[PDB]
Every structure is written in C-alpha cells, then in structure tokens.
Design a protein around this ligand. Structure first.
Ligand SMILES: CC(=O)N[C@@H]1[C@@H](O)[C@H](O[C@@H]2O[C@H](CO)[C@@H](O)[C@H](O)[C@H]2NC(C)=O)[C@@H](CO)O[C@@H]1O
Ligand SMILES: [Cl-]
Ligand SMILES: [Cl-]
Ligand SMILES: [Cl-]
Ligand SMILES: [Cl-]
Ligand SMILES: [Cl-]
Ligand code: NA
Ligand code: NA
Length: 129
C-alpha cells in the first residue's frame, strides 16, 4: 500500500507514534516518506546483504527475519515480510522497539539525513489527526 501523507500520519498516530520517545508525529511521517515514499512494500538491499523492509525500511540485519541475512538478528521477532503489510502495525511496533533502543530515530538513515533538524511538523500539516 502507498499511504497518503495524512493517512499515514493518522495511522501512525492511532498506533501511538505521536511523541513516542519524544518524536513528534511529523518525524515518523518524514521518516516514512524518505525511507519508503510511504510504500509499505518497499524493499531495498543493503551493502551487507541485509534488506530493508516496508514503510520504515526496517532492516533484516537486526530487526526482522527474512531468511537470507545470515548472522543477523530478528529483534522485532517478526518475518520481514510482515513489515510489508498494508497494515502498519508490525512496522510500527518494530519501530517502537528500534527507537527505544537508545539511538532514537537516528536508526533511520533517511530520517537523520532528511528529517532531523528540519521542520518535521510540516509533514503533518493540514492533516486531520
Ligand atoms: C531502522 C532501520 O532498519 N533503518 C534502516 C537502516 O538500517 C539502513 O541502513 C543500513 O543498515 C544496514 C544494516 O544495519 C547497514 O549495514 C548499512 O550500512 C546501513 N546503510 C547506511 C547508508 O547507513 C537504511 C538503508 O537506507 O535504511 C533504514 O534507514
Ligand atoms: Cl507524497
Ligand atoms: Cl510533528
Ligand atoms: Cl536470516
Ligand atoms: Cl495500519
Ligand atoms: Cl531520542
Ligand atoms: Na533506508
Ligand atoms: Na534478521
């Protein structure tokens, strides 16, 4: 599924991401925009052979099992394919674990490079939330 911006904002809000670990909702929407262009089916392969999955491009090196990232962890205890669902629950729940892990949203490269330090509230501007 390719979410609309506000649709995703609302979904993320419903799933408890607004101000989760101090990260306002726009951070999460911004991260999703730049990680996946709001596409739950996005996958990208990393240089180490892991793959990033879903709307928040959560990687299989650490967070999910895709059966083809040897030596990796599955800290969200999910098949990576669950992160491709049109239902963002698995991604959100995993993202909550990630962002809680001490590094905040810096885990999301695109967030660090494209959202951090910007007016992320713009990403939820105009949305009914
Ligand atoms: C939370 C999450 O999974 N974020 C992804 C990053 O992990 C991806 O970065 C890449 O992650 C792999 C596995 O840890 C690293 O080997 C790789 O070096 C790293 N790539 C960079 C450029 O840092 C990122 C890839 O675009 O996608 C999500 O942000
Ligand atoms: Cl868009
Ligand atoms: Cl915000
Ligand atoms: Cl694996
Ligand atoms: Cl959802
Ligand atoms: Cl933080
Ligand atoms: Na990415
Ligand atoms: Na894994």
């Amino acid at each position: 599924k390719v979410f609309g911006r506000c649709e995703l904002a609302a979904a993320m809000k419903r799933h408890g991401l607004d101000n989760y670990r101090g990260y306002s909702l726009g951070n999460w929407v911004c991260a999703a925009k730049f990680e996946s262009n709001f596409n739950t089916q996005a996958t990208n392969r990393n240089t180490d052979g892991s793959t990033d999955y879903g709307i928040l491009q959560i990687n299989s090196r650490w967070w999910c099992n895709d059966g083809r990232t040897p030596g990796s962890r599955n800290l969200c205890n999910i098949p990576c394919s669950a992160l491709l669902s049109s239902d963002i629950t698995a991604s959100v729940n995993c993202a909550k674990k990630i962002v809680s892990d001490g590094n905040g949203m810096n885990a999301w490269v695109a967030w660090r490079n494209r959202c951090k330090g910007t007016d992320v509230q713009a990403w939820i501007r105009g949305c009914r939330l």
